């Protein structure tokens, strides 16, 4: 069996070079891969029409921000459409990103398909022609892919059928990417939907992650050239029990250190519909947790990085600067959280006769 | 788990009605699903050009033969292209077949894809959008699908990765078909390529078939509404050891009765590049084997049913009758073999002063 | 893998002969392998002390019946103790049984062991030194064994760990028995405890049996030289819904023909604490079921074959006759039932009268 | 599934404390669990009769060394016999060890059992009554156990049956140990027998370990309260290719960081019949390997810690000193090696001189 290696040293070399480059120095990933539909929901909240032009206009503002973002963002996931668009000067977005030293990625899955005989559980489509597409994307400047699997917690969920299917499909996609020079981002998301508590989520997350890594081993996937994008362990949305960032952090690292091999260079958490503040505090807490953490604990945020930026835009180029600033702040803040250096409300201890201030009363 | 049934009684009812109708009375299946390329190879052997018109012309002659064929053929597998073609009178082929009471099927897989880290082993593509396609095919008169998985016997082959992937993909396709009213023909073919002997093939066939049925159970597939299309157990093509129809029959039924549940209504063997004569003798022997046979043992032949017909054609409508006759003979003969009633060279015992003959000398 | 056969042609033959011999002609098995702890419960009810003598006495009465029982019983499963006991004249019980042409069997499992992290689920012990034990038993005239695995239906039961464990443990035992010349009776019992209905039981039983036979394949078990002793598909003991023999038969044969290979010679149903009457009726119905049945459908009854004999005995030696006649009575009607040739003169539903097992107090 | 915890917060704590205590500060384990049959081979070479006394005498010399060994050895694995023996003054060996602050362990497996249909592959026995055995051992002062599983590299080895069996048997043992308060040392050994090279060993070891940890997850084993004792990645004994400690270290740490979770406190390498020198050198190198190592990399040596002491003893009581000094000598340099603080003054390849284990005669 060892006489039929999946990759050559050169293929392994390029994969690890990319995987590490994306998470180097505490950098994270901007998940700007919202499809037309999803982007429509975003734009709808700010009373803007969902048209290719308005989508392009927003993405343009994010990608053309000060080159300083290459200190916080090491990669960006794009939706197919955007990979071929241009800014207002004819410059291709992908080339703008690359000039700054940012790695470009592409969403590779094609949504979910129903699994018969289960309680509303799915699997994911997208394997057909994935190789040709990856080779092509590779020519067009993409260096990494992203596949999202969905597991739900409910009555009879997740089932072993759901777990085994999604794990092996994820492993298939991973293998195919590596064969074409793309670093696969494995995203086994256990959705927050439900009234289940923290503890119930942590249990399920471990089970899914153990199945995921076993499948990857069976499929001969090169761990050093991959990235994991799992959910943080948290209670469900409809849960009454409220938890702190420290509790969530503990549950998370506990689940992760019992399943994810150290060969994996970086783990980037998905924001999963979290508020910008929570996504930062939790990640910070995750990097402060005393448990063994042999890999980078970063972020791969979508709305936790764009929520306020979209709000400052309003569909007016007239508000470009504010949009760029809102994005910049969130990127800097999360990069600090990925280093466990995010001090929340300012950085000053008790005082009031400290030295020469200005911070007092109000305004 | 039992509270989320995959199918309703009505869905189960229609599936079993179709599966049984195809193999009733000893009828078999004409596998006329050769793609453009494959059909090109066929036509090339008779010095005919591979064009949609010549393909159509041949298929036309087979489908318009005497209505008597509904006594031997219960189903026909078509390649997509042919499902929408017509005869020389504007009659759609699918409607011609149906008027005679023949069930129409369609090839659903899209070929194989390489499995990295194995010794040239593959998996099969085609799941993406399979549901929409099946629903559509259903509207267009198709009642059953066919998916072909390939397993090879060689150094490190078949591997457990290859076996588990192909079994579960086959189970996926099966589930999807049943959800759309199509009876899935599960074809786990262990190819004859190689110098391996009979015994080595029988071992591998059982292993693959056991994995197949386990996967189908995990995926909640309704066995009563399916059909199996496996290879007969035989030595490899490059094997020096020659075996008789009786030896092949024994190995086959032995492998089949130890793995395929009795809930399965019919097993139709693929011809696997066998000569027209062998495909008939072996199947006959398979039905004469004394072992337990709870299911129909029929055929789903391609070139074992067309070889001589293609030869009588030559690309001339002028030779239509001969083509129709060659096909008819092969269909009648194989239907007899599926009943264990195929007497080979005529039907007369020792004699020469039996009564009033004519069969003697030569000519 | 084909160059390392588990058994030789010779070993296979013997295993095939023993298995077929036991279930031939409608004959069943007497399950008299009650442990001293389990036997003490039976004797207690009839006011007899649980001593080695009383156990021997009763079992002597049963084993010394007229030679005719060899037309009803083809095998007897013994408990270790009884395999070395003698009748009132110094003659070994096993030798008496042998001279009547009955095949002797032995219980090989050593009870359950809890699986941590489950809801009161267990696995079975008895693998240690089992090979030596089997070799010795074979020298002492024993030709087959019995291993009982228990799976329960409840909250989170039966889990996949429970199913994989019991299935695989069951397969190890089977491989070991065969290596020593004994035919292993595989008994995966889904206990009737609980308030689940017929369909829940059917679902679980098909699931359990599919795992069992996949496990036996992985372990290279020769199915032709094995026997199966599964539960019948019935509602739980605490289920209020009433089911007739016809329904119980349909659900059962349906579960069996979807999972159990035709290679298995026979399926000897366990009585599971159901009335002597019900064990007979359900059995008769199962053989009258219009579904495909490539295997013999017989019985391997304990209480259902001994209840009356025990009650008629009462511990008094003078009741030898009434005890023997009662036993032979159950042995013959169950043999009839095994041929579907049983006719019960009497009509009822759930209401009235079967004052003789009105209804047990379960457990 | 989350409502049925295997262990309580209290039980977990203790398991965590014991495991960490053993490998803390660079300390390793003394593997003195040689069976009488295995011990008799050691004594034979030094011309000493294999009697219970001679075995006791030697083991007395080792256990009665200066209190300082508690800075090198954190645990000792005992063979049943030795767990109840006393020194020349009626004091229990285990009590001597305890007063030195050393944790006592016990060998729990009962040898291999052949798996039919494989190429001389085996599984391990010892599950029967193991729980009671563990409870008693715990009362007698034992805090951890040892279970050795053997996997070989050869024609068709190690098969998946062999891998699934040993992995799952290894997991049952582990769950049972933890339920009784003992920390299970999981030892999946890929034996060095054969002519395979470094890469073949690395491939198999990663495969075996992946199965092992997936199995431990299925069985709900608490990784934080376990320890791993795997083989080092080396070429087979009959391999001509020479490898340095650096290469052996690279291959080993590579296999480990891809499969072993950071939740596991320590990895104590088994010596596998390699020279005392090599066990030390390879160990030092492994800790100097620049790959991620979230676990302690220590030793659990048998021969490699006792070879010199034995040779210096010679069976003569007068050689107590030379025997103790020799032992402490190996115990300290191996503790240094466990910290990567070992320095060997001496240069060579394959040629010359190590006249003291020039090279063993294997097996
Ligand atoms: O049912 C059946 C069953 O399954 C069996 O076989 C029986 O058994 C039990 O006991 P207990 O008390 O615990 O519950 C046992 C086991 O362990 O073992 O058994 O095998 P066994 O001996 C039959 C019998 O029973 P009944 O109730 O029915 O009589 O068949
Ligand atoms: O190596 C190692 C191993 O792994 C082990 O531990 C050993 O051992 C064997 O023996 P034999 O003779 O059979 O081979 C055993 C088992 O069974 O058991 O052991 O655990 P044990 O006691 C170590 C040791 O060895 P050496 O050679 O190295 O010294 O560590
Ligand atoms: O949390 C996430 C990303 O950030 P959000 O914007 O959703 O907070 C992920 O769960 C997914 O990207 C997203 O919601 C699902 O959309 P998809 O990519 O499958 O079409
Ligand atoms: O034996 C067979 C059918 O009859 P033949 O014409 O090949 O003898 C089967 O093995 C397959 O149909 C065929 O050769 C492969 O072509 P495909 O369908 O995958 O594109």
PDB file of C-alpha atoms and ligand atoms in Angstrom, chain D residues 31-35 37-39 41-42 77 107 109-112 124 146-150 187 189 191-192 229 231 268-274 300-306 363, ligand 2:
ATOM      1  CA  UNK D  31       8.899  -2.882  31.977  1.00  0.00           C
ATOM      2  CA  UNK D  32       9.636  -5.844  34.250  1.00  0.00           C
ATOM      3  CA  UNK D  33       6.469  -7.767  33.374  1.00  0.00           C
ATOM      4  CA  UNK D  34       8.298 -10.689  31.753  1.00  0.00           C
ATOM      5  CA  UNK D  35       6.273 -13.905  32.017  1.00  0.00           C
ATOM      6  CA  UNK D  37       8.458 -18.329  30.039  1.00  0.00           C
ATOM      7  CA  UNK D  38       9.941 -15.077  28.803  1.00  0.00           C
ATOM      8  CA  UNK D  39      12.018 -14.618  32.006  1.00  0.00           C
ATOM      9  CA  UNK D  41      14.991 -17.084  28.368  1.00  0.00           C
ATOM     10  CA  UNK D  42      16.862 -14.205  30.008  1.00  0.00           C
ATOM     11  CA  UNK D  77       4.935  -2.600  35.240  1.00  0.00           C
ATOM     12  CA  UNK D 107       0.271  -6.638  32.783  1.00  0.00           C
ATOM     13  CA  UNK D 109      -3.335  -9.371  28.628  1.00  0.00           C
ATOM     14  CA  UNK D 110      -3.267 -13.147  28.415  1.00  0.00           C
ATOM     15  CA  UNK D 111      -1.463 -13.746  25.135  1.00  0.00           C
ATOM     16  CA  UNK D 112      -2.461 -14.043  21.512  1.00  0.00           C
ATOM     17  CA  UNK D 124      -5.324 -10.816  22.197  1.00  0.00           C
ATOM     18  CA  UNK D 146      -0.586  -2.889  30.201  1.00  0.00           C
ATOM     19  CA  UNK D 147      -2.173  -4.605  27.191  1.00  0.00           C
ATOM     20  CA  UNK D 148       0.034  -5.555  24.239  1.00  0.00           C
ATOM     21  CA  UNK D 149      -1.460  -6.100  20.782  1.00  0.00           C
ATOM     22  CA  UNK D 150       0.740  -7.415  18.005  1.00  0.00           C
ATOM     23  CA  UNK D 187       0.324  -0.775  23.359  1.00  0.00           C
ATOM     24  CA  UNK D 189       2.967  -2.986  18.580  1.00  0.00           C
ATOM     25  CA  UNK D 191       6.752  -5.944  15.388  1.00  0.00           C
ATOM     26  CA  UNK D 192      10.169  -5.360  13.735  1.00  0.00           C
ATOM     27  CA  UNK D 229       3.302   2.663  24.292  1.00  0.00           C
ATOM     28  CA  UNK D 231       6.830   0.974  18.595  1.00  0.00           C
ATOM     29  CA  UNK D 268       6.346   5.753  26.328  1.00  0.00           C
ATOM     30  CA  UNK D 269       8.261   3.928  23.632  1.00  0.00           C
ATOM     31  CA  UNK D 270       8.845   0.203  23.867  1.00  0.00           C
ATOM     32  CA  UNK D 271      12.425  -0.919  23.132  1.00  0.00           C
ATOM     33  CA  UNK D 272      11.573  -3.905  20.958  1.00  0.00           C
ATOM     34  CA  UNK D 273      14.754  -5.915  21.436  1.00  0.00           C
ATOM     35  CA  UNK D 274      17.018  -3.097  20.260  1.00  0.00           C
ATOM     36  CA  UNK D 300       8.784   2.026  28.939  1.00  0.00           C
ATOM     37  CA  UNK D 301      11.791  -0.242  28.503  1.00  0.00           C
ATOM     38  CA  UNK D 302      12.344  -3.891  29.310  1.00  0.00           C
ATOM     39  CA  UNK D 303      15.619  -5.366  28.027  1.00  0.00           C
ATOM     40  CA  UNK D 304      17.007  -1.911  27.209  1.00  0.00           C
ATOM     41  CA  UNK D 305      16.843  -1.038  30.915  1.00  0.00           C
ATOM     42  CA  UNK D 306      17.898  -4.419  32.347  1.00  0.00           C
ATOM     43  CA  UNK D 363      13.692 -13.034  18.140  1.00  0.00           C
TER      44      UNK D 363
HETATM   45  O1  LIG E   2       9.665  -4.379  23.123  1.00  0.00           O
HETATM   46  C1  LIG E   2       8.565  -4.177  24.004  1.00  0.00           C
HETATM   47  C2  LIG E   2       7.439  -5.246  23.772  1.00  0.00           C
HETATM   48  O2  LIG E   2       6.437  -4.621  22.989  1.00  0.00           O
HETATM   49  C3  LIG E   2       6.661  -5.795  24.987  1.00  0.00           C
HETATM   50  O3  LIG E   2       6.418  -4.803  25.999  1.00  0.00           O
HETATM   51  C4  LIG E   2       7.384  -7.046  25.492  1.00  0.00           C
HETATM   52  O4  LIG E   2       6.493  -8.096  25.738  1.00  0.00           O
HETATM   53  C5  LIG E   2       6.486  -9.698  24.768  1.00  0.00           C
HETATM   54  O5  LIG E   2       7.251 -10.842  25.084  1.00  0.00           O
HETATM   55  P1  LIG E   2       7.515 -11.938  23.987  1.00  0.00           P
HETATM   56  O6  LIG E   2       8.637 -12.935  24.461  1.00  0.00           O
HETATM   57  O7  LIG E   2       6.180 -12.777  23.739  1.00  0.00           O
HETATM   58  O8  LIG E   2       7.961 -11.189  22.651  1.00  0.00           O
HETATM   59  C6  LIG E   2       5.650  -9.396  25.950  1.00  0.00           C
HETATM   60  C7  LIG E   2       4.144  -9.486  25.659  1.00  0.00           C
HETATM   61  O9  LIG E   2       3.446 -10.458  25.846  1.00  0.00           O
HETATM   62  O10 LIG E   2       4.368  -9.144  26.542  1.00  0.00           O
HETATM   63  O11 LIG E   2       5.967  -8.053  26.420  1.00  0.00           O
HETATM   64  O12 LIG E   2       4.784  -6.820  27.210  1.00  0.00           O
HETATM   65  P2  LIG E   2       5.510  -8.199  27.002  1.00  0.00           P
HETATM   66  O13 LIG E   2       6.182  -8.597  28.367  1.00  0.00           O
HETATM   67  C8  LIG E   2       9.218  -3.993  25.415  1.00  0.00           C
HETATM   68  C9  LIG E   2       9.819  -5.182  26.158  1.00  0.00           C
HETATM   69  O14 LIG E   2      10.402  -6.104  25.249  1.00  0.00           O
HETATM   70  P3  LIG E   2      11.928  -5.961  24.970  1.00  0.00           P
HETATM   71  O15 LIG E   2      12.539  -6.892  23.880  1.00  0.00           O
HETATM   72  O16 LIG E   2      12.259  -4.559  24.390  1.00  0.00           O
HETATM   73  O17 LIG E   2      12.745  -5.786  26.258  1.00  0.00           O
HETATM   74  O18 LIG E   2       9.274  -2.855  25.886  1.00  0.00           O
END
